[PDB]
């Protein structure tokens, strides 16, 4: 029933039993300089950044290299262009990047206070500029959506200059094959910061790679740990009563060191692009006044695919929504992209065969019971569907119900639909791919020539 085959893993083998000397616990961060557009667009840079032994990479002065006008993301330019659209804020205690104090101010702790409120771009800008003039608690404007193509056209046009594997949208990007918007992953988000502004510890949604560019005049400090160590970090989180996947925590650095976990630490200056590889655990704090922009990409490597599917199934264990619908994505990739890496091919094809199976079984049981199944085929720009009750992805065979209005329907998985009416009375059952549609797509998906 798993969409993964353990025999196919490509994770690098790492000991952790081998005790590491001090210098291996503070490894250096790969720091690259690009002399030319030619160097930026080489497949060699793609290979370097996605290498599974390379959790995080900083590409120094990339902005200058490709003639990106980062001034289009200054607080001034952004205010001039903004509407009054509401944006979200986090309120936090201002403290040094390697500290997180308890309420007493006498010890370090893992949980990190970061509360939500709302403002506008223009009103956060006044706070940011007034902080800079000096005229302890701070506010961080976070996850500001630059998704409106018309309003943000000049900003977004500048990002088309990036290498393709870094771009928001690309045929080699798994997130460009969702067919719907996932704000902040396949659209750009903006981060407006004062010193002390923190993004606390996480892996990306569904372990996807991340791209982050520092605009504003100040620096950010980054901390990162290889995917290999995430279960140990997750256990400190349990120990200290804060949820790993959805909570707000800041590691105690000496805990990780005591645990034999190497920690990358480095500074991202204005114009530096940070590439976060698949599954890397990281946290970030502004040192000065700055803005950052970031989004996710899903490059076509077997390591990315594996880690996204593993986290998809772990989310399901933990009752957490995967905001990347990996089944839908997997079929779409197979339909439109040639795959020449044998490892990645094997995994996608295994996934599709489990999905084709699951569908066949449950179609069989519905016809056995006389349940009408109607075809509602896919149409351009249609989203992928999730169950209203348990938030699992629901691919192809949909269990829908009506009357809010009599013309809109909610989607459920089979399990949740049967809990609500074990005979499925009042449940309309749809299928978006005929059985032979899936059979033919699967047969059409063959390893391309390298």
């Amino acid at each position: 029933e798993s969409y993964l085959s353990p025999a196919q893993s490509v994770k690098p083998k790492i000991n952790t039993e081998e005790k590491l000397p001090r210098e291996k616990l503070n490894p250096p961060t790969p720091s690259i300089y690009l002399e030319s557009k030619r160097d930026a667009f080489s497949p060699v840079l793609l290979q370097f950044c996605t290498d599974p032994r390379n959790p995080i990479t900083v590409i120094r002065g990339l902005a200058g290299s490709l003639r990106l006008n980062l001034g289009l993301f200054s607080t001034k330019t952004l205010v001039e262009a903004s509407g009054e659209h509401t944006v979200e804020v986090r309120t936090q205690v201002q403290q040094p990047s390697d500290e997180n104090w308890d309420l007493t101010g006498t010890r370090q702790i893992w949980p990190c206070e970061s509360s939500r409120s709302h403002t506008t771009i223009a009103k956060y800008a006044q706070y940011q500029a007034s902080s800079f003039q000096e005229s302890h608690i701070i506010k961080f404007g976070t996850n500001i959506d630059l998704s409106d193509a018309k309003r943000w056209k000049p900003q977004l046009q500048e990002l088309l200059k990036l290498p393709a594997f870094m771009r928001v949208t690309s045929t080699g990007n798994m997130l460009s094959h969702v067919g719907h918007t996932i704000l902040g992953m396949n659209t750009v988000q903006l981060y407006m910061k004062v010193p002390g502004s923190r993004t606390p510890g996480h892996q990306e949604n569904n372990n996807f790679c991340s791209v982050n560019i520092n605009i504003g005049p100040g620096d950010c400090e980054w901390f990162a740990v290889h995917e290999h160590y995430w279960e140990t970090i997750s256990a400190f989180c349990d120990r200290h009563g804060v949820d790993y996947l959805t909570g707000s925590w800041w590691p105690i650095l000496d805990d990780l060191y005591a645990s034999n976990i190497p920690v990358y630490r480095f500074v991202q200056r204005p114009g530096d692009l940070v590439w976060i590889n698949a599954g890397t655990v990281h946290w970030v704090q502004a040192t000065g006044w700055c803005n950052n922009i970031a989004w996710n990409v899903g490059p076509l490597t077997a390591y990315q695919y594996q880690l996204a599917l593993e986290r998809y199934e772990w989310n399901e264990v933990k009752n957490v929504k995967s905001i990347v619908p990996m089944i839908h994505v997997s079929w779409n990739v197979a339909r439109t992209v040639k795959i020449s890496d044998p490892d990645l091919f094997k995994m996608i094809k295994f996934c599709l065969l489990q999905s084709m199976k699951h569908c066949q079984v449950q179609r069989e049981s519905l016809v056995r019971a006389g349940k009408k199944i109607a075809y509602q085929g896919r149409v351009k720009d249609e989203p992928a569907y999730y169950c209203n009750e348990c938030d699992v992805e629901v691919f192809n065979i949909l269990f829908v119900t009506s009357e809010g209005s009599r013309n809109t329907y909610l989607v459920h998985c089979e399990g949740c639909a049967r809990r609500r009416s074990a005979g499925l009375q009042g449940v309309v059952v749809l299928e978006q791919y005929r059985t032979e549609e899936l059979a033919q797509a699967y047969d059409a998906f063959t390893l391309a020539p390298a």
Partner: peptide
Amino acid sequence: RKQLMTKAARKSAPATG
């Protein structure tokens, strides 16, 4: 066709309050 409803998916930092 039937209009099938979806929750919008959005990255958002964690929040404690």
